[PDB]
Amino acid sequence: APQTITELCSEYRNTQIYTINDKILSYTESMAGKREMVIITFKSGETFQVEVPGSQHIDSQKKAIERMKDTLRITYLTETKIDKLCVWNNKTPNSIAAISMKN
């Protein structure tokens, strides 16, 4: 398996790595029908989303979508710095595929 987020990011089409190196500015969570998602922003202006589960997702990603939302909430609440984000750029806001943090 890959050993870094950059290496893992490279195996997919439509992805790109963002070096954030900063904490989350705002956290938005929604339980409205067909918009069950999370949106995060940074002071740099960047805005990213964890997509609503759908057909583009295989069954194994369902449990991972839930884990990712858990991680972003606690990362926001603890003001923990995010290092990099691997995102799919064929979505607006860009969709989160992986995240990394370093101390």
Binding site: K63, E66, D70, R73, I74, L77, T78, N103
Partner: protein, 226 residues
């Protein structure tokens, strides 16, 4: 309880994550890494601030003593505060660790390595025109269960953190001799004091994160997610 007069108000202390040493914005900030040295800190006096340089924040053993110091240093402030702090192993009795080389012995200070996290502050009193408002405001985020049973770090754990310079006679004598950093008693001695001090701080900071970050841990229904 330890006490410290300080012009920095409660909401600022809250923004910073605690009472910080000179030049340390936030308690968990690893970027603007500070220089830590007990001997240096204990000698350098400040104007407008009770001793808080060289990685340590000073405190007194009583409200009255904290008050006296505040009057001498913060005399021209219409308002200032005296924070009431719980004892814990990030605190070192300056007289005990530096022994007979303690520069200001009579003051009897107890310093906190790396600052004082907000959760270790019990409460505070406001001081108006130099007069103490005898009503203690209590901090809602003080961790009672955790700090309930903790104490100052014993002197034995501080000897290696004393920070005396390499050729300082103290490194050739009881009981500092048995605790001298590699290259003490060459910059290395100094660079080693900074290294050890940063290690002790990092471990204490982990204990604090274990307390405050755990409040955000949300348990998952694994069987339902699986």
């Amino acid at each position: 309880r330890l006490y410290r007069a300080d012009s920095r108000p409660p909401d600022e202390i809250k923004r910073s994550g605690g009472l910080m040493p000179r030049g340390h914005n936030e308690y968990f900030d690893r970027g603007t890494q500070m220089n830590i040295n007990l001997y240096d800190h204990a000698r350098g006096t400040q104007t407008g601030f009770v001793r808080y340089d060289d990685g340590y924040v000073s405190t007194k053993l009583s409200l009255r003593s904290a008050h006296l110091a505040g009057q001498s240093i913060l005399s021209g402030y219409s308002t200032y505060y005296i924070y009431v702090i719980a004892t814990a192993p990030n605190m070192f009795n300056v007289n005990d660790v530096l022994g007979v080389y303690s520069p200001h012995p009579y003051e009897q200070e107890v310093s906190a390595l790396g600052g004082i996290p907000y959760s270790q502050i019990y409460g505070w009193y406001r001081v108006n025109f130099g007069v103490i408002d005898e009503r203690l405001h209590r901090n809602r985020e003080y961790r009672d269960r955790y700090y309930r049973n903790l104490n100052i770090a014993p002197a034995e754990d501080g000897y290696r953190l004393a920070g005396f310079p390499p050729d300082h006679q103290a490194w050739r004598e009881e009981p500092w001799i048995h605790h001298a950093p590699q290259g003490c008693g060459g910059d290395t001695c100094n660079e080693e004091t900074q290294n050890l001090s940063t290690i002790y701080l990092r471990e204490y900071q982990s204990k604090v994160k274990r307390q405050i970050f755990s409040d955000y841990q949300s348990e998952v229904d694994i069987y339902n997610r699986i």
